[model samples]
Target: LHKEPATLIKAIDGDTVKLMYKGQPMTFRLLLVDTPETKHPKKGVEKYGPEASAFTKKMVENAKKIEVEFDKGQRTDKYGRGLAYVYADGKMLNEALVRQGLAKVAYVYKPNNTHEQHLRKSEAQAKKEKLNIWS
Candidate 1:
C-alpha cells in the first residue's frame, strides 16, 4: 500500500482521526488497533480512554507531516469512515499506540493483515511490560 499525504484536521478519539485528503475532508479509523472509547454511546468512557486520545492528539497535532495507507482488504467501515494505517512524520501511529499499551489489536480480517505481525509483536512487548491497558 502506498501512503497518501494528508493534513490533520482533528483527532476524534484514540483510534479515529479526521484529515484533509486531496482537498476533501475524511475520517480515518486507524486499522488493527482499538483504543478505549471516550465517546461511545453504549460503552461510555473507559479507563485510559482519555489518555489514549491525548496520546494520539499529541502525536498527530505535533506531527510535521501526516499520511495514510489503506489496507488491501477493506477501505471503509459501515460508518463510511476510511480505514487505514496512519503515520505521523514517518512513524506508524497504529503500532506506536500498541507499543505504548494504549491500544489493543482488534478487528482482524483477511488481506488487511498487512502489519499484523508487527502490531502483535508490539502488543506482546507492551503486555510483558504491563503498560497501560495491559496493566
Candidate 2:
C-alpha cells in the first residue's frame, strides 16, 4: 500500500485527527474503525470515550513518525475529511485501536475495505478477551 508521511498536528477525537500532509494541514477520519465519541454535540461523551481519545492522543503525541495510507475507493468522507489508515511509527493506529477494544471495525465499504480483515481479526481478539467495549 502506498503511504504518505505526515506530521501529527492534533488528535481531534478517537477516530479523527489533524495532520500536516504534503505540507498542508488536513483532517483525517480513520477508516474501518469507529471509536466512542467524546465530542459529539448531541451524544456528548459516550462510554469509554475518554479512554479511546486518550489512547489515540498518547500514541500520536509520542510517535516518532506518522504516516497515512489511503484506500483505492473514496478518499474523503461526507464531511470532506480525508479517510485513511493512520500509522504511528509504522504501527497501524486503526488496528491497534480495535485490538485494544477502544474502537469497533465499522463503515466497511468496497475498495475501502482493504484492511478490513486485519481489523476484524484484531476486533475478534479484543472481543474474545472481553476488553473495553466487549466488557
Candidate 3:
C-alpha cells in the first residue's frame, strides 16, 4: 500500500487495460467494474465510448506525473498487474472511469465489498441513462 511507478498506457475495453509501471508492462484488473466486450456488442455501446476513453487517455497520457495508490492486500489478479488506483489532477481515475460510464463496478472475486453501494448506484445511473458508450 505504498507508492509505485505507474503509467496508464491504454484502456483495452471497459475493464481491461495495459500499462507500464517501473519500465515494465502490467495488465490491470479494474476493480469494481466491467465493460461490454467489444466481441459481444450486446450491451449498447456508450454514446461517448470513444470520447470517454479519449478523455481518460488524455488525462492520463497528457499528465506530467501520475499518482498511484493501493487498497487492501491484493494488488493484482493472477495476471500480475499492479492493482492500484490511478489518479491525475488529484482525481481518482478508477472512479472517474466508473462515474463517466466508461467502466462499470466489478468487485467480482469478492462482492459486497465497500464500493458495492456506490458501484450499484453508478451502474444504475449508467444503465438508466444509457451513457454514450452504453447507449
Candidate 4:
C-alpha cells in the first residue's frame, strides 16, 4: 500500500477519524473495519462500543506519526469520507483494531481487498484469544 503522510485530527469512533491530508481536512473511514456502535442515531450504543472508541482515541492521540493509505479500488464513500488504511507509528491501525478485538473485519468490497487477508487473520486470532469485544 502506498502511504501518504497525514495528521490525525481526531477519532470519531473506533473505525473512523478526521485527518489532515496534504494540508486539507478530511474524514477518513478506516477501510475493511467495523467497530461496535458507540452512538448510532438509530442503533444506539452497543456492547463494548465505548471501549472500542476509547481505545481508538488513545491510539491516534498517542501516535508519534500517522499516515493514510488508500486501497486500489475505492478512495471515498458516498458520504465523501476518504476510505483508507490508517497507520499509526508505523503500525496498521485497521489490523490493530481487529487484533485487539475492538472491531471486526467488515464491508469487504471486491475492489478494495488490499489487506483483506491480513485483517481476517487478525480477527481470527482475536476471537481465539477472546480479546476485548470478543470476550
Candidate 5:
C-alpha cells in the first residue's frame, strides 16, 4: 500500500468514510469489512449499529495520521464508493473494526481478496471474546 494521505471528512458508518483526496471529496468503503447498517431501507438499524458508527467516528476523529490504499484492480463499489484499506495511527482501520467486533469479514469479490486471512483472524478474536456485535 502506498502512503497516500488523506483527511477524514466524515464517517458514514463503521466501515465507510468520506475523505478529502487531492482536494476532492470522495467516499471510501473499507475493504474486507462490513458493519451493521444504521440506515437501510429494509433493515433500519441492525444490532450495535450505533456503537459501531460511534466507534468509527471516534477512530477517525482522533487519528493523528490517515491514509487510504486501494486493492490490486478494483477501486469503487457498485455505489461508487472507493474500496480501500484506511489507516489511522499506523493501524489498518478495516482490521481495527473487525478486531473490535464492530465489523465482520465481508470479502465478496475474489480479485480484491488480499486481506481475508487477517480479517478472519481479527473476526475470530472478536467472536471468541463476544465483543460488541459479536455479543
Candidate 6:
C-alpha cells in the first residue's frame, strides 16, 4: 500500500500488502500460508516455507485488485488491524493454502471465520493426501 506506515515505500509483497482505508492504515491480511516454523520472529520459516511462499506468489502474482471482507468477519484483535479474512475474487485464499498443504487451520483468535467449513475439509484433504509439508 502506498499509504501505510508498515508498508514498504518501494515494493509491497503482492499478496500480503497494506493499504489505507478511511484515513487509517488498514492492513488487509492476505493468505500466504506457509508451514509453521517452530521459531522465528515476524514469520518463522516452516517445513514448506519456501514452497508455500512460492505457491502463494504463483496464485496471487497476477492479482489486480484485492479486497478484505468485513461483513460477518470478526472484530479487530490485539493488533490494530481488523481481523477480517481476506478473499480474492470471492475465493478464500487461506483455504487454498490449506488445500495445497501449505498451511493448517489456525484456531487462535479466529472468530466467525467464513472459511471454517471449507478449511476443515481442506485440512482433511491435506492430511489425507500428504501434500507438501505433510509428506
Model 3 residue 62 lDDT score = 75
What is residue 7's positional error in candidate 2, in angstroms? 0.4
Off by over 4 Å in 4: none
**Candidate 6 local lDDT, 81-106, one digit each (tens):** 45544554555557777888878776
- Residue pairs clashing in model 1 are none
Work out the TM-score per prediction.
0.97, 0.97, 0.64, 0.95, 0.94, 0.67
User: What lDDT does model 1 reach?
Assistant: 0.95
Off by over 4 Å in 6: 1-16, 20-24, 30-39, 42-44, 71-73, 108-110
In candidate 6, where is summed lDDT lowest over 10 consecutive residues?
A: 2-11
Worst 10 residues of 3 by lDDT: 107-116
Using lDDT as the yardstick, the better of models 5 and 6 is: 5
List ranges where model 2 is wrong by over 4 Å.
none
Local accuracy of candidate 2 as per-residue lDDT tens digits, 1-135 = 798899988899999999999998999999999999999889899998999999999999999999999999999989989999999999999999999999999968998999999999999999999999999
lDDT of 3 at 120: 71
**What stretches of model 3 exceed 4 Å from their correct place?**
1-5, 8-14, 38-52, 111-114
Report the C-alpha displacement of residue 89, candidate 4, in angstroms.
0.5
Ranking by lDDT: 1, 2, 4, 5, 3, 6
Query: What's the TM for model 5?
Result: 0.94
lDDT tens per residue, model 4, 14-128: 8889999989999999899999988789878988888888988998999999988999986999999999999999999889989999998997887888899999999999999
The residue-by-residue lDDT of candidate 5 on 15-125, one tens digit each, is: 779999889899998888889989867978999888889988998899999988888867888899889889888789889889999898994687787788889999999
